[PDB]
Amino acid sequence: SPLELLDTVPDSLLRRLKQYSGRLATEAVSAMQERLPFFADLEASQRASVALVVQTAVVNFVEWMHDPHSDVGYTAQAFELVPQDLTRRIALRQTVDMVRVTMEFFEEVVPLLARSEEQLTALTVGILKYSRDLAFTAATAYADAA
Amino acid sequence: SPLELLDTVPDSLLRRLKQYSGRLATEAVSAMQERLPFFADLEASQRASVALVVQTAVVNFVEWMHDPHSDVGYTAQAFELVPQDLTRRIALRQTVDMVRVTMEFFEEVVPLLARSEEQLTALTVGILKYSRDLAFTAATAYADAA
């Protein structure tokens, strides 16, 4: 089962992932700069903050992989946009575009840490499940706020 | 690569999937009735229309699996809510809840048609990728309308 696939992923790899989280987040933001026109227009301060959020997401993913409990995690950090709701009016579409590019980026990269096909498949399934599951929880959070 | 995994899925299985689409859509709606309290409160007409939409989604998934072109498909049917925008004011949250339950249901079921682990993994990856990719395109469509 695809669940049994997840179980096969060493803490080794997960530990490694959290270790490299900040690098990945920087690379993700670079990919955003390339793929999203408006992203290059953002302030360096804002770009940095986004990258922080990406980094936290990476860490949360890693925790989820350990216990997909989705309740043990209990780590829904929210300090994004604390300075300002839609800080500098970041546009709904743009934020979606950013989330997309982020998830696409991780779909491309995270499997590569795997050391074996089994682990590779595990990681591809894990990231895809998380990405979706996360986007769902985000969408519900936006519905709640509406 | 997870892409090579998709290539391994016979038209046999995909053809079968589209054939069973309406049954699946009915089963999905049953699962929605069970998991979503407000869904039981919907009119039989509306429930039926939802199931139609689910059915179309199934078919679109199958097409996507053949060519993940995402442009050849060119099949973004929209007659949902033609009678009424948010027909009978269906609530943003509720629609998200429905999409979630639908995708969860398909994540659970669609892999089972596979006849081999390779195909099973392919299907799990395929559905998870599609579900996410679809939810993204939906979210952008909602951002555009805002």
Residue numbers in the entry:
A (entry chain A), B (entry chain A): 14 to 159
Sentences from the paper on this structure:
MabR (Rv2242), a PucR-type transcription factor, plays a crucial role in regulating mycolic acid biosynthesis in Mycobacterium tuberculosis. Regulation of the fas-II operon is mediated by Rv2242, the gene product located immediately upstream of the operon promoter. The MabR structure integrates three distinct structural modules: a non-heme globin, a GGDEF-like domain, and an HTH motif. In summary, only MabR-type proteins are characterized by the unique combination of a globin fold, GGDEF-like domain, and HTH motif, and this specific protein architecture is largely restricted to Actinomycetia bacteria, with few exceptions.
The crystal asymmetric unit contains four superimposable N-MabR molecules with a mean root-mean-square deviation (rmsd) of 1.8 Å, calculated over approximately 140 aligned Cα atoms. The segment spanning Ser83 to Leu105 appeared highly disordered in the crystal and could only be modeled as a coil in each chain. The N-MabR structure consists of a bundle of four long α-helices (α2, α4, α5, and α6) and two shorter α-helices (α1 and α3). The helix α2 (residues Asp24-Arg48) is kinked by approximately 60° at residue Ser34. The dimeric interface is formed by the last two antiparallel helices, α5 and α6, burying a surface area of over 1000 Å2. This interface is primarily stabilized by hydrophobic contacts and salt bridges, with 37 % of the interfacing residues being charged and 33 % hydrophobic. N-MabR was identified as a globin fold using the Dali server, an unexpected result given the lack of sequence similarity to any structure of PDB. The absence of residues for heme/Fe chelation, along with the closest structural similarity to nonheme globin sensors, suggests that N-MabR likely functions as a nonheme globin sensor. N-MabR adopts a “truncated’ 2/2 globin fold, a simplified version of the classical 3-on-3 α-helical sandwich, characterized by a 2-on-2 α-helical sandwich of the helix pairs B/E and G/H. Helix F, typically involved in closing the heme/ligand-binding pocket, was not observed in the N-MabR crystal structure, possibly due to the structure being in an apo form. In contrast, N-MabR elutes as a dimer with an apparent weight of 47 kDa.
